Design a protein around this ligand. Structure first.
Ligand SMILES: CCCCCCCCCCCCCCCCCC(=O)OC[C@H](COP(=O)([O-])OCC(O)COP(=O)([O-])OC[C@@H](COC(=O)CCCCCCCCCCCCCCCCC)OC(=O)CCCCCCCCCCCCCCCCC)OC(=O)CCCCCCCCCCCCCCCCC
Ligand SMILES: CCCCCCCC/C=C\CCCCCCCC(=O)OC[C@H](COP(=O)(O)OCCN)OC(=O)CCCCCCC/C=C/CCCCCCCC
Lengths: 68, 54
């Protein structure tokens, strides 16, 4: 209740969440994942024995496919 | 890692070498050339001035 009234201005009932969930389909997932993930620059953090953590260019090039 | 850093670096080097090679081939082909090798061979006479390839 508290978090919702601060963030949304209103309590969202479980029924509305269910109606929102029911609309997703594979096409929606494809679209929105592409809208936020595909060919984007990431933020990376590492701590430990991280010699083998790939170079930043190698990580950036992993955000897209050449066969697409 | 070698890729991508030195891959693109060596490609740049190759582009430069090709520029030089083309200019030598087309714009000034006779720069290093020797006239005495445009005379066919004569087993009886050595020319007065002898000079190998540079
Ligand atoms: C000579 C001078 C030498 C000295 C020079 C000195 C200086 C040198 C300095 C530079 C040195 C550089 C060193 C090399 C660095 C390599 C880096 C590297 O590998 O990074 C790995 C890099 C890093 O990613 P990763 O972390 O490993 O992640 C892997 C993931 O899977 C990533 O997944 P992904 O989806 O992002 O990428 C995967 C996909 C990404 O690629 C693609 O999906 C396509 C890419 C663009 C299109 C290319 C299509 C080519 C198709 C073949 C040719 C036909 C063209 C059409 C004409 C048809 C004619 C009938 O690539 C592949 O799966 C590999 C093969 C792609 C081509 C498919 C064909 C395979 C058979 C090839 C032989 C065919 C022969 C017969 C041809 C027909 C009859 C004539 O990932 C790669 O896998 C890179 C792929 C690189 C592929 C290069 C292909 C070159 C060969 C082309 C064909 C040649 C024959 C042509 C014959 C004549 C007909 C045209
Ligand atoms: C002949 C005189 C020419 C003179 C002009 C200059 C010549 C030299 C120019 C540079 C040539 C470079 C050749 C080597 C490939 C270099 C590739 C490069 O730098 O890009 C890297 C990049 C790798 O991708 P990453 O982002 O690291 O990984 C993504 C993973 N998700 O390379 C690629 O794009 C790999 C995919 C294949 C690309 C195409 C390869 C070349 C062939 C394509 C044409 C096919 C037909 C060839 C016909 C030849 C004649 C019969």
């Amino acid at each position: 209740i508290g978090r919702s009234l601060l963030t949304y201005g209103r309590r969202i009932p479980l029924a509305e969440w269910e109606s929102r969930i029911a609309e997703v389909d594979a096409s929606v997932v494809r679209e929105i994942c592409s809208k936020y993930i595909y060919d984007q620059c990431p933020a990376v953090a590492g701590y430990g024995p991280i010699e083998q953590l790939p170079d930043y260019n190698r990580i950036r090039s992993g955000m897209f496919w050449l066969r697409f | 890692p070698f890729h991508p850093y030195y891959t693109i670096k060596d490609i740049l080097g190759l582009v430069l070498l090709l520029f030089i090679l083309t200019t030598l081939t087309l714009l000034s082909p006779n720069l290093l050339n020797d006239p005495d090798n445009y005379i066919p061979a004569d087993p009886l006479n050595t020319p007065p001035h002898i000079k190998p390839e540079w």
